[PDB]
Design a protein around this ligand. Structure first.
Ligand SMILES: [Cl-]
Ligand SMILES: [Cl-]
Ligand SMILES: [Cl-]
Length: 163
């Protein structure tokens, strides 16, 4: 575990992370995709060997010794708000199990279902609160990655509020 488990936010490409493993915002079919998924595919293409996994699940594949946790959040274009919310909570619980099992002291994690799977809604709070619910009982240092300047400020505020 980390000596003082923390949450941080960085506004940068998660493919450049400084952590012991990465969570991919994956698609169910283990395809290269777009956004975080495409960056992950460019950096760690070996991790897409048999990475296909259902919505609401996480599947880890090693790129050398570096673990890539493929977490499949729901596409809110396809799911009801109710069913999407349940699958998004579930994907993050499966990320917490994998981070624990791997014994890492840090993890780089994007906000699942906040991009092309958001169904054109702002889901920062929804996705961030499911991330906290899952990861709060883990002792890894968690570093949340984003690209938008206003999102970085809101994620930072939400982290500081609890401290
Ligand atoms: Cl960057
Ligand atoms: Cl997304
Ligand atoms: Cl963002």
């Amino acid at each position: 575990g980390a000596m003082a488990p923390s949450y941080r936010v960085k506004r940068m490409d998660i493919a450049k992370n400084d952590e012991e493993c990465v969570v991919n915002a994956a698609n169910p079919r283990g395809l290269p995709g777009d956004g975080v998924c495409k960056a992950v595919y460019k950096k760690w293409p070996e991790s897409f060997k048999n990475s296909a996994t259902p919505v609401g699940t996480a599947k880890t594949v090693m790129c050398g010794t570096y673990p890539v946790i493929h977490a499949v959040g729901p596409n809110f274009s396809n799911y009801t708000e109710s069913e999407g919310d349940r699958e998004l909570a579930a994907a993050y619980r499966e990320v917490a199990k994998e981070v624990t099992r791997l014994g890492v002291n840090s993890v780089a994690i994007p906000l699942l279902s906040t991009g092309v799977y958001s169904g054109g809604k702002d889901r920062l709070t929804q996705s961030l609160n499911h991330l906290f619910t899952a990861m709060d009982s883990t002792d890894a240092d968690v570093v949340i990655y984003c690209r938008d300047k206003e999102w970085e400020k809101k994620i930072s505020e939400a982290i500081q509020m609890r401290t």
